[PDB]
Amino acid sequence: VVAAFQQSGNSPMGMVLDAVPVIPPELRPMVQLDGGRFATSDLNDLYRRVINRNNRLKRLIDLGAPEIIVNNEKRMLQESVDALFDNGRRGRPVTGPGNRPLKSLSDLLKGKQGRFRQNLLGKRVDYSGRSVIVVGPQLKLHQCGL
Amino acid sequence: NNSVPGAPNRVSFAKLREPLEVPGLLDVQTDSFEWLIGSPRWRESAAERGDVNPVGGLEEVLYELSPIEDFSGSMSLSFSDPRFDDVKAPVDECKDKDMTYAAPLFVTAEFINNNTGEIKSQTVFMGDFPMMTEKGTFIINGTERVVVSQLVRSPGVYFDETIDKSTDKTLHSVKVIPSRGAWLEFDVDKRDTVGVRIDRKRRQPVTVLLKALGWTSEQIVERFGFSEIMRSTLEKDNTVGTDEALLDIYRKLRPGEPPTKESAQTLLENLFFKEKRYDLARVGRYKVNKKLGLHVGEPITSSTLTEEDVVATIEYLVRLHEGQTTMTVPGGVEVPVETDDIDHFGNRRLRTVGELIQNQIRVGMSRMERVVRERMTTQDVEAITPQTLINIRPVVAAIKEFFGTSQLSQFMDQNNPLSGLTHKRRLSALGPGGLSRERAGLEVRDVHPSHYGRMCPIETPEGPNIGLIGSLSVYARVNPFGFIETPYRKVVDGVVSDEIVYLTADEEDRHVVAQANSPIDADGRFVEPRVLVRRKAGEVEYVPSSEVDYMDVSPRQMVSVATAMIPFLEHDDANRALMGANMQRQAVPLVRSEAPLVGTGMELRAAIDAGDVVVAEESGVIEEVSADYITVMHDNGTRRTYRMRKFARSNHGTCANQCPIVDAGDRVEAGQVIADGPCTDDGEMALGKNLLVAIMPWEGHNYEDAIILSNRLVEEDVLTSIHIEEHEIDARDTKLGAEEITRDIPNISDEVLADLDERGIVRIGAEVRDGDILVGKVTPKGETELTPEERLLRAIFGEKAREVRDTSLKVPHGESGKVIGIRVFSREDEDELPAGVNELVRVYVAQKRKISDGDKLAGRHGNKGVIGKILPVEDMPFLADGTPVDIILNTHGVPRRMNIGQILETHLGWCAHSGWKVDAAKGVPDWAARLPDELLEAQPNAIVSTPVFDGAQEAELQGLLSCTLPNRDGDVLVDADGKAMLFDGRSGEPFPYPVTVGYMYIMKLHHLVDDKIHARSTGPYSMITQQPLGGKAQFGGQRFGEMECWAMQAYGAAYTLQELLTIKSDDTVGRVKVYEAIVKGENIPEPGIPESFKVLLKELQSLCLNVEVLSSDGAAIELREGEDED
Amino acid sequence: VNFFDELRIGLATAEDIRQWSYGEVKKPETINYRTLKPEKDGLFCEKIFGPTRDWECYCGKYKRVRFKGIICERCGVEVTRAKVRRERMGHIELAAPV
Amino acid sequence: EHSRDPVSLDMPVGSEEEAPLGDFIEDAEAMSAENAVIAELLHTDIRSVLATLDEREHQVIRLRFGLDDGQPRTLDQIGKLFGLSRERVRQIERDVMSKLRHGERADRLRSYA
Amino acid sequence: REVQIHLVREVQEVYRAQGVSIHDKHIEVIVRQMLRRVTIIDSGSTEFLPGSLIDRAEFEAENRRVVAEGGEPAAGRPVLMGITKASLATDSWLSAAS
Ligand SMILES: [Zn+2]
């Protein structure tokens, strides 16, 4: 590991973050499906927890709360970032309304339903169609009846 | 002997008299529910079965729960005596109005007030309980739902054992499985550290737990002095002492807690003696008592495990490990010592509708009593009344969830009456509380010698759910505990007896079971000295006729309902019969139904019990009959009218009709069939037609399982079917305004709106096609941005703003046909619509589908096929009398598949159609000695029956084929071998050799071509992935998986693969450019970068992983790019 | 064109994350409950990620494509293609390293 | 309706090949190529047609409506700005609509309706 | 060579016994990719750590070149892998992700 970093293409400072990025809204859309019911991807929920807890800490550190308060808040912030990048990696995963674990940021790449596995499954092409087949003996070897 | 009066007398080849009539086929479903609600009929039936104090389902769930305390004993609540009320509305009303067939449930709760002493009791509404219609289907939310029985491991003790490989020493392990609680695996190891593993915790020697139970060292030694391994383990244990033992148990079970003696005792009692935390149902207690022979005489009580059972278990384990064959626990009778198998149907119980609902009610009551306990311990005590205590939200929520989401509450498939009947008889194995697909090892999907008479081995889904789904046999019955019984008739002394006794798997092993086909003298004496028998464990071997103890009832005992109506099933293979059974449930009802010429006796009973046909309740004379209703005048002077539905859409689309068969002024006896539902003729199931089959390869048009059909079937509506589609749209109030269905739509010609009525919904009888407007719906867009130029145009013409959009219901692509009927639910008239909607109209459009290329046909023997060609009538080969064969089947698929039964069916079909006259002047020919005396002469178009496993023999068919009556011209067409000389339809010269001909019963499966046709030049795309998809507006693309990608790579086709993935699937700018290039003459441009990759890159960067697409010179390429076309 | 000789994946230093971002997300709000429009400087802010509808500006002063590639003073939302909403990113600047 | 808690897109729907509900959502919008051409044609056509009309009337349309600065001026308000009366605006609009429906103006603007 | 004979003979025996037939080169194209790796004991003058599997292309030629300059040769002997390990060792991270 030390040699791996010794090549020094990237410093070890990357292991600790000072600013997390947010994916564009389209990849986590907020659509209003037919019926007046709003639908959102779990990424929005996880980001809200991170942003809200961070803002509270910014307010709380300015106020001047005792040491225990700030320490607890930073613990909440670290936990929220932990859940964002991987939910269920540690501890009991954050659950949804039906006790369903939220699909964290790394859950888009892992498992059967991930970007890499989905690429294996194949992409749904256009200009196509399917139908039943029936033997036709009046065709030549290089023909097919549509 | 026809039980139903108005039966069509079909002479049958049966040679063995059946002593027991088929039981009510759907009683598996109805009896369970009758037990649940404590109906009077169930209690009356339980009186005969031999139960002194039977208790209903609800009467048990809310009786055991009561009384509920308040942790102090100063307040207690008890409820009992549950009673129902008359259903709110009949089934038909709840089906038309999209209501839920239910009845309100009232229970009598009483509050005691231990401190003061005064009591208060009154009835408490508990909710509208979904009741079960007479046919065993729940009408939930307007859709007939059927809950399939479930197979689950029986709670009890299973003395499992395993053999070590490295040591070659036997390791036994008993595994107590309760209904709810902990596991007590007493496994023995090669180390001899026989130990407990409570909750799969770290193994601890059993001596520790036994001492923690308080057993003294002297008592243990004296009792177990006959077990060497027990003594060695006792002398090898390290921890000793009851207080030390329980503390160790407390630490092991809940480590990190204060190790106090009182705490350990609470855990011990809470784990073994608490009647709520640890519990096994009455069935579990019965199994444990029978296995260990403890309290055998005592009736089932005190469900919770008792310590005397645990010590008996440890004695059983050690005694088995010694090798003893029998053991006797003191205070109980002796029982055999042997290993046990789960798959054995003695250990797999059946939880019918009553059990499933009861558990859901139990969970609901468990939640309710939690709330009432909290309220009781917190609410005021002076003026507390049960109404304010009892809550009904959790119970109603629980029951609704079960019928709305549970995997065991499935949409009753109503393809035909047989499909409905078989669905009720299903025995699902997967689902909540049962083994999943992945966890289901291959060992459980196999057949077991205990399935004989309890669960059909032939019928089961061919897909992945193979072996996890079965079906009750014809005669199978479910005992109150849940074990599936099966009738047998005992033999007192080598002589068969009339009276029967129902035996379960456990009682079968001890006794000896004969076989039905074994010959028996008229007086019951066994003619043979030895008879084939089924011994304890799947072993069959001859035995002396005196040793036999039980005999089957009929040879058809092992086959399900679907499999029981495949003639000559005794000649097919298991694979084909399995496909034959699973395709009779896919047939589609035709316009006009014809009873099969050759079919088993199960045809009639299956139709009567399926509920499709209406059967007269009491004898009477029909005063007036009409196409809509028939009224029967009873003998008591009371009138009754049988309203029968016409052209009503089933669940799966096929239509349902009930055309009366009786005539005015005709006497009808009670129980007779009055009208024929779908797939029925004169009251006997008829899923298809009779077609004159010729078995020969014809010009390759029937190559490799394809089929060739005469044009007679298309033009004479032989195989024409009706299908009903339902389209529905609703008007909901939006933020901008209220949506309204109206005849006026923006900028549409009057011709497109010609067929719309005044209300704005197409008028009945209007022929629609793919795209026409069914419902004129306009939605408001008033509070929407308006372009400055656009509202200027509005003012210029004075044109109405007309912001309202037009989301008007339209026929999805591929649908057509008349509009049989429309229903409109309006909140203005208080029709109980869902919250947020005002107008809800559903339009039914009916299309009459004929048979064309691509449709699937199939016989009863699993001989599938697809209509390769439909030749004109003159092209079909015709018999010497000008009759053209109506279908042709390839002969290369008959012997290889090994379903010779269909050939036999064809032969007997022709003999039944032509009619025969056995030569009787010189006496009965030797081959006809066994034929019933009334089967020696049959008229043309006669109907015959060959019951499964007992029917026409090979000698009999050969005899009949040589005795068929001549044609009206005076010539016999088919020769003695069943072959006939056909004339070629095209060439016109006779085929060189004779060919087989006869009538085979051909159904019409529901895998029609019209459903399976898709095409997509361009259509709607997704939102997150930007890939093709469309809901019948454009059919949607076809997946191009990885395996197809490998094929393209193997060819070396690099350009074609790039197009299939980049230009026409994801590359958005590519898709637009290519469609503009194709429409014009320009060459298709070069593809771009797939949207899938860019999404992957922009989502890999979000995890704080710097990803760069380097180029030559090690310089990053800025993937972001923007160019404005035009 | 389509020359991507190799592909490198490396740890993203905090400086890199700021470079990618087109702005900072500072509020947890997602969308207004009446106008159904992304809220200012929120998790869907049009200023940071991009305009919602093609060649709109969040104010109306630049609803026409005649003004393109122009950032508006009233709102600061670049008037450009709507699909740019699928590629632009923002960052949450934490007050305590994680 | 406000009390409703929004559904999650990641929830599988009907166990349809473990496909999240978000997969089936139809974009069915953002046809930038179509929007640009229509916007260019219609806006340019109306501007040119208004230019062919009386220039003061072109200003009236801009102010009466707000083609440039929004704020559609009412009959009285625009009369105040131009010094005219509230009743003159109706006739002015009547003249504009009549002119717009004759000549090459109709040939250009017959579409877009 | 002998292990190559064994693997081809064993696989081909399985298929022929079952009825089907496929030409050998379709199997040799696999065992080639299965067998192109050399295990090492001691580095001595090679940067890569001992016990690390290195393919002939990288090992044999580079080690010979290092011998030319003066570095002591590393000891390597043929090793055989599986169709899984052979891919994992040399596949790129894109491919190995799935
Ligand atoms: Zn602006």
**Quick check: E98 and A109 CB within 8 A?**
no
E80 neighbors E35 (Cβ within 8 angstroms): yes
B589 neighbors B647 (Cβ within 8 angstroms): no
Question: What is the rounded CA–CA span in Å between residue B549 and residue B488?
Answer: 10
Resolution (A): 3.5
Tokens for B537?
């464990």
Report yes or no on chains E and D touching (3+ CB pairs under 8 A). Answer: no
B291 neighbors B344 (Cβ within 8 angstroms): no
Fill in the amino acid letter for C88: R
DSSP label at C86? G
- Give phi and psi for B693, each to the nearest 5: -85, 145
Question: What is the rounded CA–CA span in Å between residue B174 and residue B186?
Answer: 5
Question: What is the rounded CA–CA span in Å between residue D21 and residue A58?
Answer: 37
Question: What is the rounded CA–CA span in Å between residue B1099 and residue B1119?
Answer: 14
Spell out the SS3 assignment of chain A.
CHHHHHCCCCCHHHHCCCEEEECCHHHCCEEEECCCEEEECHHHHHHHHHHHHHHHHHHHHHHCCCHHHHHHHHHHHHHHHHHHHCCCCCCCCCECCCCCECCCHHHHCCCCCCHHHHHHHCEEECCECCECCCCCCCCCCCCCCC
Question: What is the rounded CA–CA span in Å between residue B766 and residue B764?
Answer: 6
Is the CB of residue A69 less than 8 Å away from at least one CB of chain C? Answer: no
Is the CB of residue D78 less than 8 Å away from at least one CB of chain B? Answer: no
Burial code (b: 16+ CB inside 10 Å, e: under 16) for C56-72 equals bbbeebbbbbeeeeeeb
Question: What is the rounded CA–CA span in Å between residue B1047 and residue B922?
Answer: 73
Give the A-side interface with E, CB within 8 Å. 109, 116-117, 119-120
Q: Distance, in angstroms, between B1104 CA and closest chain C CA? A: 5
Per-residue DSSP letters for C20-84?
H-SSB------B-TTT--BPTTSTT-TTTT--SSTT--SSSTT-STTS-SEE-TTT--EES-GGG
In the three-class reduction of DSSP (H, G, I as helix; E, B as strand; rest coil), residue B444 is classed as helix
DSSP label at E91? S
Q: Which residue has the tokens 């096994």?
A: B280
Question: What is the rounded CA–CA span in Å between residue B852 and residue B1013?
Answer: 14
Q: Is it true that the peptide bond before B567 is cis, omega within 30 degrees of 0?
A: no
**Torsion sign across C-alpha atoms B307, B309, B312, B316:** negative
B814 neighbors B771 (Cβ within 8 angstroms): no
Q: Among residues B16, B149, B124, which one has the least CA distance to residue B472?
A: B149
B592 neighbors B723 (Cβ within 8 angstroms): no
Where does D25-87 have alpha helices with state H?
A: 32-52, 55-65, 75-82
Within 8 A of D18 by CB-CB distance, chain A residues are 112-113
| Residues contacting B861, CB < 8 A, separation 6+ | B566, B568, B572, B576, B577, B580, B899, B901, B902, B905
B797 neighbors B860 (Cβ within 8 angstroms): no
| Residues contacting E11, CB < 8 A, separation 6+ | E27
Residue B35's H or E segment, with its range, is helix B27-36
Question: What is the rounded CA–CA span in Å between residue E81 and residue E34?
Answer: 6
Please state at what angle helix D88-100 crosses helix B788-797, rounded to 10 degrees: 90
Tokens for B768?
């629609």
Using the mean position of ligand 1's atoms as its centre, give its distance from the Cα of residue C79 in Å: 8
Question: What is the rounded CA–CA span in Å between residue B552 and residue B679?
Answer: 32
Using the mean position of ligand 1's atoms as its centre, give its distance from the Cα of residue C56 in Å: 8
- Give phi and psi for B403, each to the nearest 5: -80, -15
Q: Which residue has the tokens 């379960």?
A: B504
In the three-class reduction of DSSP (H, G, I as helix; E, B as strand; rest coil), residue B2 is classed as coil
In the three-class reduction of DSSP (H, G, I as helix; E, B as strand; rest coil), residue D50 is classed as helix
Rounded to the nearest 10°, the torsion over CA B435, B438, B442, B445 is 50
Question: What is the rounded CA–CA span in Å between residue E63 and residue E73?
Answer: 6
Residue B881's H or E segment, with its range, is none
Question: What is the rounded CA–CA span in Å between residue A129 and residue B1014?
Answer: 5
E86 neighbors E33 (Cβ within 8 angstroms): yes
Interface of B with A in 734-753 (CB under 8 A): 734
Interface of B with A in 414-453 (CB under 8 A): none
Radius of gyration (Cα) for chain B, nearest Å?
A: 36
The structure was resolved experimentally with cryo-EM
B431 neighbors B407 (Cβ within 8 angstroms): yes
Q: Distance, in angstroms, between B1113 CA and closest chain C CA? A: 10
Length of chain A in terms of residues written = 146
Is the CB of residue A97 less than 8 Å away from at least one CB of chain D? Answer: yes
A65 neighbors D32 (Cβ within 8 angstroms): no
**Quick check: B1020 and D28 CB within 8 A?**
yes
Q: Is B1123 exposed, middle or buried (0-12, 13-18, 19+ CB in 10 A)?
A: exposed
- Which of A27, A123, A125 lies nearest to residue B1099, judging by beta carbons? A27
E4 neighbors E12 (Cβ within 8 angstroms): no
Question: What is the rounded CA–CA span in Å between residue B328 and residue B425?
Answer: 41
Length of chain D in terms of residues written = 113
| Residues contacting C74, CB < 8 A, separation 6+ | C57, C58, C59, C61
In the three-class reduction of DSSP (H, G, I as helix; E, B as strand; rest coil), residue B267 is classed as helix
**Torsion sign across C-alpha atoms B403, B404, B408, B409:** positive
